[PDB]
């Protein structure tokens, strides 16, 4: 319909119908005024000043200007000062530290510009360095990480909306580039108009956070037909607006190098040019800022959404080769797989039969099926109705498809893609980039790799905003910044522990347990009391006891070899802590102690587990949190069989756990010069990544109130300087953790029929976790007493050990 864009080009506030629009998204909606192209998308004379244009009389038809009034008008070509005034390109100036913001009068805060690049793999920073001098200058003069970890799936929309919200895709709702919502009965796709509907997009993205708190924000989306040079000129024009109208945060988005990467693979010879072109665009922005005297005022973030892997048509696994009944399913295909029934509310569709037909069927099978609740917890990819129950994790370099006709399209199936992304977010080729440059970022500083969910908090800090609740750990990235507005502090402990002494006589217990412990001194009797009272506690609890951050009733139990926090509600430890030195020796469970379980005289029969329940439950067995194999003496070993150290374990899981405890702990202590281990149960029956309350538990040991954990964790800490033993470390710490699913079969591990040395450790690596992940799942807070700064501890708690090569 009707109206004009005269005096409205790239207006910031979008107008409602039936009035026509002139903002940077109007093209997407087909709702621009009829003169939008003519007035707002000028192209005459290209994007660069030449010597003969210098001082020209202003011609309003030109794309940009070289006339003398152009600085005052805000619309010079970005190279104006270089061609027409003897100025140097930004890239050609030496790095000079920006100690304080150097902003024109009227700038109330340094603006933030987010420059996002689609498909920019982390290793492009080294491999394309010779063709990206503007980017290489940002990177070396500012703050950079060797790589930034994306979220899963390593697709465009989930990651860019994660960047804007600090939320996992399960929480923000953009769980893929394609998705079907069974409540909406509608599908979201990269291409098309459904994605414009606000109903898909949850959380509070940065532009909304900013606006609600009185900080003006540019649009983060761009119509695809607006060329990059015009996006840049538009941002530079918005930056010349009056103080009261000017945004403080700006976003530029590039579809490259992703668009070429898909055609040519991540390192195709055709990739050099798209990298040169992105660099040139960075150059334009920086020259533009320098003309406006804003180059030592603005904070610039150069950030990618994901990397890019070599993927061709012939590396496609077809479901039709596994299932006889493939027309019964709908598959979301590609570098991940999501399966649901073709016919909604079809009662005779069995996910269990589909999973079974897809499990370990071909020796080199290039995907693994999972019920979504069994996916590695580090992916946080389950708590959303748009995530199908059945998920296929696809090997890097591979695709999955339903039938061959979906891939090999008529006439005779030519391929025409050599690159793709979307795989597991720990995969090297999916890693992407982060550089921060400006007064608020540090000068010439490397920082360790970190996750993109953390940036939202930092952007809010950069803008003086209070972040909406999100999945970052605020303070974990304080080390990126010259000046921090946020001072993290430890959460307050909610429940204080009881410290029970000996309160019960053996004959008060009727637990159906037995142990051969009657076997067989004044000197070694005070020593026993000392231990039960906390004398070895500084050895086994190295970083203070974990804080309990919810209301509950629990006891601290001390022993020679380990300390625990025992829950009277869940009838088992919430945590068990012990230190194993490089010198410690592994021993066996003596014959006469094979089935030994001992009542704990500090803990009431009524708050204890019982052996009878385990006897009666033909599916469920038990294991121990502190391992008897690692007892310091035959006498201390009796403590490991206390009923208060016992936890429910499926026989299939006991294979995993026993190998970890008997073989792997000692190997880690050898490799790391001692380790401290904290282990415990996790209950997450509604798969939301958060500690279950007792009324959420769906499974108990038969005929008891003993709840069955969904997972078991361990956090394994040592000295970063491994020349110092774990128990006498003066400096920073080193951690690796896992959250192992507690499953009644080893179907996940295709080699599980073999010896544990051939599969267990591979499983654990797959289920590697951050300390922070375990904290959410347990309501515990770790590392309460160290000699390290809290910001450093927050970084340590966000660390993920990925087991990739470098
Ligand atoms: C990662 O970080 C995030 C963010 O911190 C964590 O996610 C949060 O987790 C909380 C606990 O699970 C959860 O609290 C819920 O919230 C319920 C209200 O939810 C709606 O409103 C939310 C707030 O909106 C306002 O603020 C934001 C600023 O952030 C603005 O942008 C808004 O516009 C508002 O001004 C809102 O965020 C939330 O969004 C979800 O749902 C949307 C609409 O469908 C989606 O678009 C969106 O993507 C979100 O979807 C996710 O989250 C939902 C669960 O909320 C989930 O189902 C989806 O799969 C997806 O993951 C809503 O619009 C509130 O009703 C709840 O209270 C009930 O339970 C509590 C205790 O659990 C009781 O104390 C309480 O009394 C009440 O019980 C009653 O109601 C029950 C039904 O729920 C009923 O059964 C019972 O019998 C009782 O009657 C509860 O507080 C937050 O909503 C959630 N936020 C987000 C964004 O996801 C996340 O946990 C972190 N992950 C990890 C691993 O740490
Ligand atoms: C939540 C919200 O307010 N809305 C309103 C506007 N809706 C909308 C409207 C017009 C549009 N025109 C073009 N494109 C292409 C495109 C891709 N990208 C990369 C990118 C950039 C930023 C984020 C974020 N966050 C992202 F997810 C993807 N930018 N433009 C869009 O996706 C698009 C989306 C989306 C829903
Ligand atoms: Ca992308
Ligand atoms: Ca839960
Ligand atoms: Cl997807
Ligand atoms: K049993
Ligand atoms: Na198996
Ligand atoms: Zn892509």
């Amino acid at each position: 319909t009707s109206g004009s864009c005269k005096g409205r080009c790239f207006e910031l506030q979008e107008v409602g119908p039936p009035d026509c629009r002139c903002d940077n998204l109007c093209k997407s909606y087909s709702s621009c005024c009829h003169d939008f192209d003519e007035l707002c998308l000028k192209t005459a004379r290209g994007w660069e000043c030449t010597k003969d244009r210098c001082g020209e009389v202003r011609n309003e038809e030109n794309a940009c200007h070289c006339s003398e009034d152009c600085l005052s008008r805000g619309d010079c070509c970005t190279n104006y000062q270089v061609v027409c005034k003897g100025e140097s390109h930004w890239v050609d100036d030496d790095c000079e530290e920006i100690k304080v913001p150097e902003c024109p009068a009227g700038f109330v805060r340094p603006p933030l510009i987010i420059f996002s690049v689609d498909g920019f793999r982390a290793s492009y920073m080294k491999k394309g360095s010779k063709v990206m001098p503007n980017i290489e200058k940002l990177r070396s003069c500012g703050t950079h990480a060797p790589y930034m970890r994306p979220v899963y799936p390593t697709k465009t929309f989930p990651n860019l909306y994660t960047l804007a919200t600090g939320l996992y895709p399960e929480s923000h709702g953009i769980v893929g580039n394609s998705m079907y919502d069974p409540v909406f009965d509608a599908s979201f796709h990269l291409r098309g108009r459904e994605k414009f509907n606000h109903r898909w997009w949850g959380g509070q993205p940065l532009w909304i956070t900013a606006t609600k708190q009185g900080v003006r924000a540019g649009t983060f989306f761009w119509s695809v037909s607006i060329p990059h040079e015009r996006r840049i000129l538009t941002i530079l024009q918005w930056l010349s607006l009056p103080d009261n109208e000017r945004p403080s945060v700006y976003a530029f988005y590039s579809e490259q190098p992703d668009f070429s990467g898909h055609k040519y693979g991540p390192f195709g010879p055709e990739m050099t040019n798209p990298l040169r072109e992105i660099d040139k665009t960075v150059g334009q922005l920086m020259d533009g800022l320098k003309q406006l005297r804003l180059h030592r005022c603005v904070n610039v973030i150069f950030v990618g959404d994901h990397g890019m892997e070599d993927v061709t048509c012939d590396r496609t696994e077809f479901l039709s080769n596994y299932l006889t009944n493939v027309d019964d399913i709908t598959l979301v295909p590609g570098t991940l797989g999501r399966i649901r029934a073709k016919s909604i509310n079809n009662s005779k569709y069995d996910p269990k039969t589909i999973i079974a037909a897809l499990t370990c069927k071909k020796p080199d099978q290039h995907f693994k099926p999972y019920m979504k609740q069994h996916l590695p917890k580090r992916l946080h990819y389950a708590n959303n109705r748009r995530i199908e129950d059945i998920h296929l994790l696809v090997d890097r370099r591979w695709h999955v498809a339903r039938k061959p006709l979906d891939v090999y399209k008529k006439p005779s199936g030519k391929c025409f893609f050599q690159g793709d992304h979307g795989f597991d977010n720990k995969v090297n080729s999916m890693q992407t980039v982060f550089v921060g440059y400006g007064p608020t970022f540090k000068y010439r500083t490397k920082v360790p790799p970190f996750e993109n969910i953390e940036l939202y908090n930092v952007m809010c800090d950069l803008l003086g905003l209070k972040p909406a609740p999100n999945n970052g750990t605020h303070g974990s990235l304080n080390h990126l910044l010259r000046t921090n507005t946020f001072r993290p502090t430890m959460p307050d402990e909610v429940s204080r522990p009881n410290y029970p002494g000996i309160m019960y006589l053996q004959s008060e217990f009727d637990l159906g347990c037995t142990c051969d412990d009657k076997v067989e001194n004044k000197l070694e009797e005070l020593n026993k009391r000392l231990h039960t009272k906390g004398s070895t506690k500084e050895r086994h609890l190295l970083y203070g006891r974990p804080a309990v951050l919810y209301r509950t009733s629990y006891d601290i139990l001390y022993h020679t070899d380990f300390e625990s926090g025992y829950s009277e509600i869940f009838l088992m430890p919430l945590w068990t802590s012990y230190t194993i030195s490089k010198q410690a020796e592994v021993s066996s469970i003596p014959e006469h102690l094979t089935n030994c379980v001992r009542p704990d005289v500090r803990v009431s029969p009524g708050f204890s587990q019982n052996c009878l329940a385990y006897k009666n439950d033909k599916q469920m067995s038990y294991g121990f949190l502190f391992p008897p194999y690692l007892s310091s003496s035959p006498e201390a070993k009796y403590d490991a069989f206390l009923v208060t150290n016992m936890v429910p374990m499926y026989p299939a899981f006991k294979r995993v756990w026993a190998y970890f405890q008997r073989v792997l702990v000692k190997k880690y202590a050898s490799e790391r010069n001692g380790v401290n281990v904290i282990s415990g149960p996790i209950f997450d029956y509604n798969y939301d990544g958060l500690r279950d309350t007792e009324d959420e538990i769906k499974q108990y040991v038969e005929g008891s109130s003993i709840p069955v954990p969904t997972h078991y964790y361990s956090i394994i800490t040592s000295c970063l300087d491994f020349t110092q033993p774990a128990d006498k470390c003066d400096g920073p710490l080193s951690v690796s953790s896992f959250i192992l699913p507690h499953r009644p079969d080893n179907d996940e591990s295709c080699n599980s029929s073999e010896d544990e040395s051939k599969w267990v450790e591979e499983l654990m690596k797959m289920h590697t976790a951050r300390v922070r992940d375990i904290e959410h799942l347990t309501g515990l807070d770790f590392y309460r007493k160290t000699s390290r700064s809290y910001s450093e501890i927050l970084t340590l708690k966000t660390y993920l050990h990925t087991y990739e090569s470098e």
Side-chain angles (χ1 to χ4, degrees), residues 28-29 157 160-161 164 195-196 198 201 207 220-222 253:
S28 300
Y29 292 92
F157 281 69
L160 291 178
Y161 201 52
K195 73 165 181 299
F196 303 162
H198 287 78
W201 308 78
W207 56 92
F220 289 30
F221 295 92
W222 286 96
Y253 168 65

Side-chain angles (χ1 to χ4, degrees), residues 389-519 521-611:
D389 294 348
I390 297 169
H391 196 82
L392 311 181
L393 286 176
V394 184
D395 285 6
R396 67 194 77 189
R397 296 170 50 81
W398 286 71
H399 270 171
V400 69
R402 190 173 64 112
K403 297 203 274 199
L405 73 82
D406 296 341
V407 156
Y408 298 100
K409 203 159 153 291
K410 313 166 127 227
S412 12
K414 298 160 169 263
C415 190
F416 283 97
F417 67 78
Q418 304 183 75
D420 207 355
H421 53 89
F423 304 104
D424 185 341
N425 69 332
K426 73 179 194 165
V427 170
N428 275 346
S429 63
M430 301 294 96
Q431 305 309 295
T432 188
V433 296
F434 169 82
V435 175
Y437 175 91
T440 314
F441 285 106
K442 293 186 163 160
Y443 175 63
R444 300 191 173 274
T445 295
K446 172 171 82 193
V447 302
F450 64 87
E451 300 189 334
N452 74 347
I453 59 169
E454 304 299 326
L455 280 176
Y456 172 77
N457 280 335
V458 172
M459 302 190 291
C460 283
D461 290 345
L462 289 170
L463 293 161
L465 294 172
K466 186 189 143 107
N470 66 98
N471 300 130
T473 295
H474 199 171
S476 74
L477 295 189
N478 275 18
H479 62 286
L480 275 60
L481 296 186
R482 162 182 307 270
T483 69
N484 285 287
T485 172
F486 182 79
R487 268 133 171 206
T489 57
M490 294 189 183
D492 290 329
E493 180 158 37
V494 177
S495 295
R496 60 152 167 282
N498 303 292
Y499 300 84
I502 303 178
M503 301 158 54
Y504 302 92
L505 296 175
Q506 170 86 18
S507 63
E508 303 189 68
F509 292 91
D510 178 19
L511 305 175
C513 292
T514 58
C515 180
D516 178 18
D517 57 350
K518 37 269 173 182
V519 201
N521 170 221
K522 293 199 169 197
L523 331 166
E524 284 146 32
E525 262 175 297
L526 167 64
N527 222 7
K528 179 201 85 239
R529 290 164 253 189
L530 276 166
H531 293 157
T532 312
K533 298 196 186 220
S535 83
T536 64
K537 85 165 161 286
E538 313 302 338
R539 210 204 167 244
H540 296 303
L541 195 68
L542 287 185
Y543 323 104
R545 72 179 165 73
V548 178
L549 307 185
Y550 59 99
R551 181 70 261 153
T552 196
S553 181
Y554 79 104
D555 304 309
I556 301 302
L557 301 184
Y558 296 116
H559 318 77
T560 309
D561 295 336
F562 62 102
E563 177 170 334
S564 64
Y566 181 85
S567 166
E568 295 194 338
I569 308 306
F570 287 69
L571 310 173
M572 69 187 70
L574 304 174
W575 60 264
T576 294
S577 179
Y578 61 96
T579 298
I580 301 298
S581 73
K582 185 190 193 334
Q583 292 74 37
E585 189 125 282
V586 178
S587 58
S588 49
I589 296 177
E591 267 192 67
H592 75 107
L593 302 177
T594 298
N595 301 293
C596 162
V597 181
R598 307 171 59 237
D600 186 336
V601 297
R602 299 165 295 189
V603 174
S604 79
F607 292 133
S608 288
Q609 297 178 40
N610 77 83
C611 292

Side-chain angles (χ1 to χ4, degrees), residues 613-622 649 651 701:
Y614 287 105
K615 192 177 185 303
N616 288 331
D617 189 320
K618 303 292 183 247
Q619 312 316 308
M620 185 63 67
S621 180
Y622 63 87
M649 299 196 167
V701 178

Side-chain angles (χ1 to χ4, degrees), residues 574-762:
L574 304 174
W575 60 264
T576 294
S577 179
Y578 61 96
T579 298
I580 301 298
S581 73
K582 185 190 193 334
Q583 292 74 37
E585 189 125 282
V586 178
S587 58
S588 49
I589 296 177
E591 267 192 67
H592 75 107
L593 302 177
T594 298
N595 301 293
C596 162
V597 181
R598 307 171 59 237
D600 186 336
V601 297
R602 299 165 295 189
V603 174
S604 79
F607 292 133
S608 288
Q609 297 178 40
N610 77 83
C611 292
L612 181 59
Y614 287 105
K615 192 177 185 303
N616 288 331
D617 189 320
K618 303 292 183 247
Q619 312 316 308
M620 185 63 67
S621 180
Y622 63 87
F624 290 107
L625 289 170
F626 173 78
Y629 322 106
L630 290 179
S631 64
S632 54
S633 77
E635 211 203 324
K637 200 191 294 285
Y638 285 94
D639 297 339
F641 305 106
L642 289 164
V643 73
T644 45
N645 184 41
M646 193 178 57
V647 287
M649 299 196 167
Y650 284 122
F653 190 74
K654 285 171 68 183
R655 302 183 59 199
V656 179
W657 193 245
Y659 183 80
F660 161 64
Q661 285 193 321
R662 179 175 58 86
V663 178
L664 298 178
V665 179
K666 188 61 225 163
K667 183 176 90 156
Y668 303 153
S670 301
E671 295 166 348
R672 299 169 52 176
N673 189 10
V675 291
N676 175 256
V677 183
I678 303 175
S679 297
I682 275 161
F683 307 86
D684 191 21
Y685 277 95
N686 62 353
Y687 51 88
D688 64 353
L690 308 175
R691 167 194 60 94
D692 285 356
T693 49
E694 22 163 337
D695 67 5
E696 287 160 345
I697 303 309
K698 294 169 91 180
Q699 185 183 355
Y700 292 84
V701 178
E702 221 196 335
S704 73
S705 299
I706 313 165
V708 180
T710 51
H711 298 79
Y712 281 101
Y713 71 87
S714 295
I715 300 171
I716 309 177
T717 316
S718 59
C719 203
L720 182 69
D721 174 10
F722 54 112
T723 69
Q724 295 196 307
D727 66 357
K728 284 188 223 69
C729 174
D730 295 323
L733 306 180
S734 178
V735 69
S736 63
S737 304
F738 60 74
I739 300 161
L740 278 172
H742 181 218
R743 280 180 58 177
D745 59 67
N746 289 301
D747 291 353
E748 181 176 358
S749 300
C750 297
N751 283 358
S752 66
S753 72
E754 300 170 50
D755 183 66
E756 286 86 4
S757 61
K758 308 300 160 235
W759 59 279
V760 168
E761 204 170 353
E762 184 185 312

